[PDB]
Design a protein around this nucleic acid. Structure first.
Lengths: 206, 138, 49, 151, 98, 97
RNA sequence: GACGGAGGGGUACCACCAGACGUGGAGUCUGCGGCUCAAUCUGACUCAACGCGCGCACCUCACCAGGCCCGGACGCGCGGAGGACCGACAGCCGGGCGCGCUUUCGCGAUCGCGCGGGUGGUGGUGCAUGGCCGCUCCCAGCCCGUGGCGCGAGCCGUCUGCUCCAUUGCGACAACGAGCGAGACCCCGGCCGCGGGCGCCGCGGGACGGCCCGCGGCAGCGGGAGGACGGCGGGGCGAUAGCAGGUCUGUGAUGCCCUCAGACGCCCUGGGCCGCACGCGCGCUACACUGGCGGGGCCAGCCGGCGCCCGCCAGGACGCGCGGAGCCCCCGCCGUGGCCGGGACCGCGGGCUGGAACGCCCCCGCGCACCAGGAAUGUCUUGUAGGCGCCCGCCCCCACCGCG
C-alpha cells in the first residue's frame, strides 16, 4: 500500500552521525571549557546545537565570536549555510556529578604531576558533595614504574550491572598522555537520586 | 466458487485436455525439446506438458481476479530447487520464455486481457474457466 | 607526475572516523569501521538490547 | 500475511455477524460467520476439500464432536494467511470451534460445547502458543552449538 | 488544503509526548489520528572483540526508528502556526508536505 | 616542488581570514575542495587542487595562522590573531577592514 | 592461598544417564600445519588457535619483481629576477610516464642549498602501554564501619544446620548493621483490554508459588487445579581479585624504537596470499525407493518491488512502481542394478561484472570415490534435536561462511 523508499529515515541517520562527529570535534575544541553533553535539532534548515557544558564563557567570549568562529567552522565543514549553524551553550548544575567534566579535570590535573592518589581523592570529594552516593576512579597504566597496574580509589556504593546501571551511572573514559605512555583515567559516578525515577529495587515503605 | 470448489490440479489436468481439443494454445516447436526451468535438468515426459502448463497459467490468472500480474510471477509458481551442486540446494524460477509464450497466446486468442502491467482473466475467458468447472461439477 | 599519481580508479571506502579501508560496514549507508563503530555507536543511538 | 488490516479487507458488504479467530505457529486465521446454510469455506476453498487429504479429519473434528444440527445453520467463511500448511489446518480447527462458541456464548450452554470439544481434543478450543526460539551466536540453532574442535 | 505530516523519533518516549502535543495544537485544524509506522529496526551485529581472538562473541547494536501518520486540512499559514505550536523537543524529524 | 598558484593562495587566505573556518577532509591527489573558487589567468573562476590547498593549510599551521582540531578524518582550522594581521599583509587588506 | 589417586556436602547435556542427530571413513569447500616459490604478507596453537581477525582478479595489501615521485613543513645561515623552480614537440630507450636522454620550446620565486626541527608508516616490541574483548567465572562470590579474638600474618561477621539454582532464603550464634554481585531491572514473545490509523501499534493491565491438599518452626518441598502462560523463556547487563591470554596490522590512542628522498612515505604496473608428495580443524554433498525423477496443487518469517517483449538458458533491450519459499500434498515414473542414487573432475560453447578473469552463471556433454564410516569423539531435553528453505553482512562478480 506504499513505495518503501522513505528517505526520512536516512536523513535521521545523518544527523546522528553529525552529532557523533561534533561530539569528537567539541572534545578537541573545548577541553578548556569542559565540553560535555551535545544534542542537535534542525527544524526547517535552521540547525540548533544544545551543548550542555561546564563553562560556556570560553565557548562564547567577547561578542560571542569564539562561538561564532566555531559555528562558522562547522557551517563550512558540514557545507551548511554560513551562520545558519547556530549553537546555544548552557551551564550545568552539579559540575561534580557530571563525570565528563570530572574526568576532564582529572586528566589535566594529572598533567601538572600532582600525586595520583591525591588527584583522585580530590575528584572523589567533589562528586560526593555534588550528591553522587557512588563515586569510582580507576587510573591504570605504567604509574611510577615500568610495569602495568590498575589503581582503583572508590568512595561510596555504585551499582555495576543491569538496566539501572545504564541510566544511573556516569562512566567517562579519557586517555592521559605521558612520557612513559598512555595512563587512561576512568571515572564512574552513580546517582540513585537521578530524578528520572527510582532505583528498581528501592522500596520506600514510609 | 465454481472453479475454486473444483480441486485446482484436477481442474488443470481436465482443462488442459479440453484446451487441446478446443484448439487453444497449439504448442510451439521449441517446447518439444526444452526442459522447463533452470533448476530442472530433465524435460517433462508428459508429452502434453505444454497443455497442463497452459491450464495452470490461465486458471492461476483466474485466481488473480483483478491483479494483472505478469509472466515472471507465474514462472515463480512453477519453480523448484536446482541440485547437482556440492553447495546446498536453492530455488530457481521457471523458464520465462515458455510462460511468456502462453500468456501472449491466451491474450492473442482473446481469452486474457492486457489491462495494465500484466494480464487478468478476460470476461470472454472468464466464461471458459467457469464453463469447464461446471462440466467437472456434473 | 600528473599521469602517475592516482591513475588507477577503485572504491576506497573507509571508516568516517578511522580511515581504515577494511570492514567498512555500509549496511545502512554508514561508512563505519566495525572496530571504530564499536568505539562510537552510542552517539549514533544504536542500543545494545 | 502477518496481522495486517487483511482481517476485514477480503469481504465488502455481505456483513458477517459472528467474528471468530484461530491462530497457532504464526499461522493466523480470521473466521466470519453469516449463519446461512451451515457450509464452511477456508481461503475460498470448501472445508470438505482441504489440501492435505489425511488432515481433512483434523479439520473436521469440531464438526465431528457435535451433531449436524449445530452446523446446520452456521455458515462460516475463514481466511488463513501466513505460517505453514500444518499450522493452517491446526488454525482452522481453532477458528471453527470459536465460531460455535460465539453462537451460544451468552447462554450457559457455551459450557456444553466447550467441555465436549476440549475433552475429546485439547487445543480444539485453545491455542498452544509454542513460538520459535532465536539462534544465538556460536550455534546454528537456539539449542544447537557448532562442534568443538579440541576438548 | 491537506498537508502530510511524518514524525520520526529514535526514542519512543521523546516522540510519545510529541504525538500528545500534535493533537493538542491542531484540534481546530482537524489533525489526522496518529497511526504508527511499524518500527524500522536498524540492526548491526559486530564481533565484540577488536581482534578475532577468544570465543566469537557478537555485539548486537539496534536503533529502532518510530514514525507517526498525520494530515491537517488547514491554510498555508495555519500549518506554520501548528509547526510553531507543537512542543519542541530536540533531535526530532519534522515533516511538512502536500 | 609544488608551483602553488598565487590566485589559489590568496582566495584560501581570504576564505580563512573572513570565515575563520577551513575544513579540509583527508584526500589524495584526485578531487577538488568544495567552497573555494579561484580566477584563472585565462579569466575563469574554477575549483583549486586538494594538494596545493593542503600545502597552504600546512603553511598557515607552520606559520601559526591557525589552530588544529582534527576529528573524524576532517581537519578543523580557526584563524589565530597573529595570523589575522599576517593575512591582511599578503592580501593587501587593511586592519580597519 | 593452591593442590590431594583425602573425607563429606551440593551442582552443570561446553558432565554423564536414557536417548538423539552427528563427526571421524568418501568427494568437495574453507582455515591451519608442512613443502615449494621472486613472493607464496601475516596474527595465533588445549579448552579459551585452526570460514577466527566478517566475500584476496586491481585497490584492499601489509608480500615480491620493478617503475615514478615528494607532499622534507617552518625557522636559521646561504643562493637566487632573465630568471629559484620546473614543465613538455619529435626521435630513441624503456611494457610504459620529456621517467628519462638527443635536443629546444615554453616557465616564473610558488622557491634551490646547508643546519636545527619536521613528516609519514598495515615497520618492530601487546614482556613499555591505554582502551577493548577472551577467560578464570552455568559461579555464587566479594566485602567495609564499629565491636570481639590473637605479639602478629589473620580470623569473627563472611555459618560443617536446613532450603534454593543462587552468600536463595529460614533458623541459630562475638557479632551487629550495611554494601556490591545474585536478584532486580531491561529486550522480545504468547494473552487481555483502551485509543489510533496508510502501516497493526502506542499505552496499560495479566502470575504472585496466590488457590487446593499433604509435609515441614520455617525457608520452602511435592502433587493437584484455575488460566495464553506455573513454578531459572529465547535474550542484554554481567561483582571482586586476576592472567605478562589476544589485539601497537582499526584509528589524530600511544611510550620506547626503526626507517625517512635509490624511504620501512605515497602512488603506478605485473605477479602472491587461491601456489601443493602430504597431516589436521569447521563445514557442505553423498551413500538411495521413508529415495531420485517431475507434472501440477499450495503456505512462510527476518520481512518484502515489478511489467512488456527477445533469448534453451545465461542474460539483455525497454519502460513503470510494485509484490511471497522450500519441505510437504496428490498423480505418474524408475525398481534394489554403483542403477533412472552421487556429482567430483574434465571438454566444446553461451552469457554477465569490471579497465581487466585469473570471478561467477548457464546449456550440451563427462560420470571420481561413496553401498553407512576404526580408535576415538561433538553438541543438544519443546517448537527442542533434526530435516527444509530464505535474508542480510563483508560484495564489481562470487557462500559449502557468519549473523539472522
Amino acid at each position: 500500500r506504499r513505495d518503501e523508499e522513505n528517505v526520512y529515515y536516512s536523513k535521521y541517520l545523518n544527523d546522528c552521525i553529525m552529532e557523533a562527529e561534533l561530539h569528537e570535534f567539541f572534545s578537541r575544541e573545548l577541553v578548556d571549557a569542559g565540553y560535555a553533553s551535545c544534542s542537535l535539532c534542525r527544524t526547517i534548515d535552521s540547525i540548533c546545537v544544545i551543548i550542555q557544558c561546564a563553562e560556556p564563557e570560553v565557548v562564547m567570549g567577547d561578542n560571542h565570536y569564539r562561538l561564532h568562529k566555531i559555528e562558522y567552522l562547522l557551517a563550512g565543514r558540514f557545507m551548511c549555510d554560513p551562520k545558519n549553524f547556530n549553537i546555544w551553550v548552557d551551564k550545568i548544575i552539579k559540575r561534580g556529578l557530571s563525570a565528563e567534566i570530572m574526568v576532564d579535570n582529572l586528566r589535566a590535573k594529572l598533567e601538572e604531576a600532582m600525586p595520583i592518589r591525591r588527584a583522585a581523592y580530590s575528584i572523589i570529594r567533589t562528586a560526593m558533595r555534588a550528591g553522587a552516593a557512588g563515586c569510582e576512579v580507576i587510573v591504570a597504566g605504567k604509574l611510577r614504574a615500568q610495569r602495568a597496574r590498575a589503581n582503583k580509589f572508590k568512595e561510596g556504593c555504585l551499582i555495576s550491572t543491569g538496566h539501572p546501571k545504564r541510566i544511573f551511572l556516569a562512566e567517562a573514559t579519557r586517555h592521559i598522555k605521558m612520557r612513559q605512555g598512555v595512563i587512561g583515567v576512568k571515572v564512574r559516578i552513580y546517582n540513585p537520586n537521578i530524578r528520572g525515577a527510582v532505583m528498581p529495587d528501592k522500596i520506600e515503605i514510609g | 466458487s465454481s472453479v475454486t470448489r473444483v480441486p485446482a490440479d484436477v481442474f488443470i489436468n481436465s482443462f488442459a485436455a479440453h484446451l487441446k481439443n478446443r484448439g487453444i494454445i497449439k504448442c510451439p516447436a521449441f517446447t518439444d525439446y526444452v526442459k522447463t526451468g533452470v533448476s530442472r535438468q530433465y524435460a517433462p515426459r508428459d508429452a502434453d506438458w505444454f497443455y497442463i502448463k497452459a491450464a495452470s497459467v490461465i486458471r492461476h490468472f483466474y485466481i488473480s481476479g483483478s491483479h494483472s500480474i505478469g509472466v515472471a510471477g507465474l514462472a515463480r509458481k512453477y519453480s523448484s530447487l536446482q541440485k547437482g551442486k556440492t553447495t546446498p540446494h536453492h530455488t530457481k524460477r521457471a523458464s520465462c520464455k515458455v510462460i511468456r509464450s502462453i500468456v501472449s497466446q491466451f491474450l492473442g486468442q482473446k481469452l486474457l486481457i492486457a489491462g495494465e502491467r500484466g494480464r487478468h482473466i478476460s470476461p470472454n475467458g472468464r466464461k471458459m474457466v467457469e464453463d469447464f468447472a461446471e462440466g467437472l461439477q456434473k | 607526475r600528473e599521469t602517475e599519481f592516482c591513475t588507477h580508479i577503485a572504491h576506497k571506502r573507509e571508516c568516517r572516523i578511522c580511515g581504515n579501508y577494511n570492514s567498512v560496514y555500509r549496511k545502512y549507508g554508514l561508512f563505519i569501521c566495525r572496530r571504530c563503530f564499536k568505539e562510537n555507536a552510542g552517539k549514533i543511538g544504536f542500543v545494545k538490547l | 500475511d502477518l496481522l495486517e488490516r487483511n482481517d476485514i479487507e477480503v469481504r465488502e458488504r455481505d456483513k458477517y455477524t459472528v467474528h471468530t479467530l484461530g491462530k497457532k505457529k504464526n499461522s493466523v486465521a480470521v473466521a466470519f460467520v453469516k449463519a446461512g446454510k451451515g457450509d464452511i469455506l477456508v481461503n475460498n476453498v470448501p472445508l470438505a476439500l482441504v489440501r492435505p487429504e489425511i488432515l481433512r479429519t483434523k479439520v473436521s473434528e469440531p464438526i465431528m464432536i457435535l451433531g449436524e444440527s449445530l452446523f446446520k445453520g452456521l455458515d462460516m467463511n475463514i481466511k488463513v494467511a501466513g505460517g505453514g500448511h500444518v499450522s493452517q489446518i491446526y488454525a482452522v480447527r481453532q477458528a471453527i470451534s470459536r465460531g460455535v462458541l460465539a453462537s451460544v456464548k451468552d447462554e450457559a450452554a457455551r459450557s456444553e460445547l466447550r467441555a465436549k470439544l476440549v475433552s475429546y481434543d485439547r487445543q480444539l478450543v485453545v491455542s498452544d502458543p509454542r513460538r520459535c526460539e532465536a539462534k544465538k551466536f556460536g550455534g546454528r540453532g537456539a539449542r544447537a552449538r557448532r562442534q568443538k574442535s579440541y576438548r | 488544503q491537506k498537508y502530510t505530516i511524518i514524525v520520526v523519533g529514535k526514542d519512543l518516549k521523546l516522540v510519545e509526548r510529541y504525538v500528545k502535543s500534535i493533537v493538542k495544537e491542531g484540534r481546530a485544524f482537524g489533525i489526522s489520528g496518529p497511526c504508527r509506522a511499524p518500527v524500522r529496526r536498524l540492526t548491526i551485529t559486530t564481533r565484540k572483540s577488536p581482534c578475532g581472538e577468544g570465543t566469537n562473541t557478537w555485539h548486537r547494536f539496534e536503533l529502532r526508528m518510530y514514525k507517526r501518520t498525520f494530515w491537517v486540512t488547514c491554510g498555508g499559514n495555519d500549518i506554520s502556526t501548528i509547526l510553531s505550536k507543537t512542543v519542541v523537543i530536540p533531535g526530532i524529524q519534522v515533516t511538512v508536505e502536500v | 616542488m609544488v608551483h602553488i598558484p598565487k590566485a589559489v593562495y590568496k582566495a584560501v587566505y581570504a576564505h580563512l581570514y573572513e570565515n575563520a573556518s577551513l575544513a579540509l577532509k583527508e584526500y589524495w591527489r584526485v578531487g577538488n575542495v568544495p567552497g573555494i573558487t579561484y580566477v584563472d589567468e585565462n579569466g575563469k573562476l574554477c575549483n583549486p587542487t586538494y594538494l596545493h590547498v593542503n600545502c597552504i593549510m600546512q603553511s598557515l599551521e607552520s606559520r601559526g595562522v591557525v589552530k588544529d582540531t582534527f576529528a573524524w578524518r576532517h581537519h578543523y582550522y580557526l584563524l589565530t590573531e597573529k595570523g589575522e594581521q599576517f593575512i591582511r599583509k599578503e592580501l593587501d587588506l587593511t586592519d580597519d577592514v
